[model samples]
Target: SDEVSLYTTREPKLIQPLLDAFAKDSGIKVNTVFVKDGLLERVRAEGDKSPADVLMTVDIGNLIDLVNGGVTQKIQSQTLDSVVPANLRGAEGSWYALSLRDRVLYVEKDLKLDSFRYGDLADPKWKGKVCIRSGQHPYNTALVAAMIAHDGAEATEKWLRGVKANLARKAAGGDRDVARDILGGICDIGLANAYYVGHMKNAEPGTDARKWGDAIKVVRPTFAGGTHVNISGAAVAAHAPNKANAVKLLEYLVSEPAQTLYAQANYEYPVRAGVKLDAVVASFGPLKVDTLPVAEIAKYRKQASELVDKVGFDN
Candidate 1:
């Protein structure tokens, strides 16, 4: 039987359904292994005998690390190049993004905020009214990296200081917790991933998550540039035993069915344009993704982390 093995940092449950759909349609089974950490080390240990046909990650930083670790091979796929935006694809095709998640705003419904910019998160009036996860989390770190890319390190550091001053609670908890805090009136606005709203809104009707979703509306926050987005992406293993099958799977990922599954099931924005968003996501409004190349943003991740500690943001 034809098959390809995947080594992925993404949770298996999130990607299994799409792999199942591809197997059903193409008659090529996918063997997925969840690598919670040390993906590059595991693959390197396997060497040329590695069964890993693909390497997938939840963060662009992880994908870049795989490329830098020399565990991934360059691919020239017209299917991927055509479907993925230049900024979202590896310059030499070592990897390409499958889905996107924006850093957006969650506001009290009564506030009726028609517009927002990420810079506004620092305004003194919002003191004790803003909520977010730990500044060191990859999600927030990526946004901080993007900020550094857009503005110089000095400006981004100042911005971080301002945001820290406005913290409704200590910079802590997951994205959903931001909504939970909002509902508890601990804050009136927050920074959370766009997909979390879908999960919260679509949770079983009477759940606390649903109630939190109901208490707020989403706002797409742009900077002077554009809205910040991050990606879940993948690359072909350098030593793929099932090379052809791996390419087939890569093409399958960018195809309409797979992209639709990404949007509908994962609540993530599709990497390929024109794939419809889940209603909850669409209602947040159209995404105008920032033009800063993810690779460029990734270059500043270290600086972003340094700034987080330098500002005592999580304190």
Candidate 2:
């Protein structure tokens, strides 16, 4: 069989095991490239001439962009459909998400916080006290995309205007930066992925970082609209050199084995249901994930970005 090439932003430390496992089980000599940075530029440069047979990356926004940019090709795969949820897959079946990360609020454990609505941050008490990462980041961009899907661009703009108005300091930093801002008394509320909290505690102890770990509560919203969720997913490349083997390998990655490996190692919520989370993940408590279909949100990314940019979001 022809060789299948794989590309991803996931570091080798995370995906190497799956590659090793697939190599052992299928004898498929998969060639892999890992990029922790410069994803859009790299993919764009590769163009249609890219040798990649399968592409993988985190975030639905990026996946949708791939489908839009003609980087991914749609496939008819029963194995893929049976394993992944419909809402998590692209409309034309061009791509399917493998795992999810919830964009969540880390609340000051003592403010007596109760509401799970994203809009709850608008409450008067939360005014002047929310920490957010730079709105330009795709993680925040996707969440804004969800709001634009649930509400309209106008309404999402209003929500973001409110969030901007509430800033303890101008949003700066990554997920952990938001967490650190919260711990440093920069804000009473902040945005973060579930995994960052776990990594911080596991990495070091007996400092404000550890106390920051203990001092906060996580809020997961649901039902009214849906929690802002995004995923790390894979797609078949349009001109895949090893099209058939690529399909098989992509299917293998969605199998129960790979799904579990993604969750346990990365602390991401599995997109496929029924996988139990690792202990560190579970301690964050049960979540009420936004049940909204991500396709709708993914589709609105451009509109959301416009509003975010128009509102001078990063400034």
Candidate 3:
């Protein structure tokens, strides 16, 4: 009863350091269960008897699922409201985006590019010159969803066709391969998460990943409004046993010091603007999250995936 129990989808090690830090600083013991799958189903089965005070998840879809499953409750705080953007948090205040995985462009180091829009990936000027991972990838599906939110399904489908037409190779590899292909001159630019840049560049100097990291400079691309991102987010469980402590943990997790740890630990961009980032991601400069509501983007996820398939983006 003295501790708050958390059910998280992120690997225990990835977040253990921050949880330990929260425990030390707040004097509230955090007992965690790393539920790699069936987090929502497990909680629903437990119903009001569940011990899960906080529900943490990495992907925006998974976090939204927690909300849709009626496993989350609404709460408000000035700290959360101000630190997290209006568009990124839930409409009902049930969930908060804690950090961001910026989907950025890795343009060839000498590509002479200063700015990019997600739509620009389809521009004919770059025909046969783009690189990317599988269109079905959630990272990509999320971006396509945002594109649908900004334009329309028809426009998004057209955009997918353009992007598919520009692909230098079949979209069969991971994000890092986008950088690797850039290094091999298979394409001049590719879209991938910003965090991987830290790992690649910070790798032991002689590694191929490091060289791939060195081959491209990251660009924070914009949509009609701002940058596209998927979030690492959390919510207070509906049937919390320690609501106060759960709120405390949620607040502390996004506070400046804890958010700084977020940068160092995962290299994901902090949702809070003033918080500093790891050196590698910092090089990409400040990110303004897309103004389209996160929920709206999630709404289009189905069409986004369908568009990818219809366009034969992966073929």
Candidate 4:
């Protein structure tokens, strides 16, 4: 077996366990480089001499950027085709999603939220009660892109304006801060990723993070269409020295055990169906991913960012 090299935008800690397990199970050593930014440029610069076997990163937009920049190659893998949903993988097999993170709501404990919709965030009752990160953040921008995919530009613009009017504070801070603010009684509910609940709830006992986790309950909010989800994905590098080994790694990622590793390590939802979630994540309830192809939704990301500016969502 040959060594596989990875140029990943993801932090090393998040992927080390899976890489170690893959190396043990397949006898293929994995070398990883942590590239904080400019991954596409670096790969393009190296051209055909690049050693990067795989390109790993979170966010559909970033993955698509690699494809658009011509830094990735297509693979024909039956295993990937079988395990990963068509919408979650590249149409030409250029990339595949390994895990998902749904954009879910975090509500104060007393709120009776057996059901809620993304549209409800803009309702009068929620005015001055919503906490969120910057509208320009990829997470929120992707959510906005999904909105455009479902509702079109005009309607999504109106929704953004409404959500901005409902902010408990300026649209700034990380997802965990949403829960923190809820605990501080600064907001009734907020938008954030589902995985953070596991991280926060399982944080060292008596920590402020745990308190924040305990103070809010998760609500899976769907559009009139379906729930919005984003991905952590990878592609085979265009100039991979170990192309076959890279394909093997991609196939391994969607296998049941590997899927389980992703869930246990990061609290991310497994891309393959029927994979049991981490107990804390399961407590948030099952995720029903929006059916729109992420490739399709990603097309509107630029529009989504523009709408954020047009609506002054972070102002």
Clashes of each: 0, 3, 0, 0
Q: How high is each candidate's TM-score? A: 0.91, 0.86, 0.82, 0.90
Error of 3 at 70 (Å): 1.8
Better of 1 and 3 by lDDT: 1
lDDT per residue (tens digit) for residues 99-169 in model 3: 87888999898989999988999999989899999998777888998898889999999999999999999
> lDDT of each structure?
0.88, 0.77, 0.86, 0.88
Is 2 or 3 the stronger prediction by TM-score? Answer: 2
| Residue 134 in model 4: lDDT | 96
Q: Compute the lDDT for candidate 4.
A: 0.88
**Candidate 2 C-alpha error for residue 47, in Å:** 3.2
**TM-score top scorer:** 1
lDDT of each residue in 179-267, candidate 4, tens digit only: 99999999999999888888788888999999999998988888976788899899999879999999998888888998998787778
Task: Please list all clashing residue pairs in model 2, or write none if there are none.
Answer: 59-231, 226-290, 227-290
Please give the lDDT score at residue 97 for candidate 1.
Answer: 90
Candidate 1 vs. true structure, TM-score:
0.91
Model 2, poorest ten-residue lDDT window?
A: 220-229
Residue 5 CA displacement from its true place in model 3, Å: 4.3
> Which residue pairs come into collision in candidate 1?
none
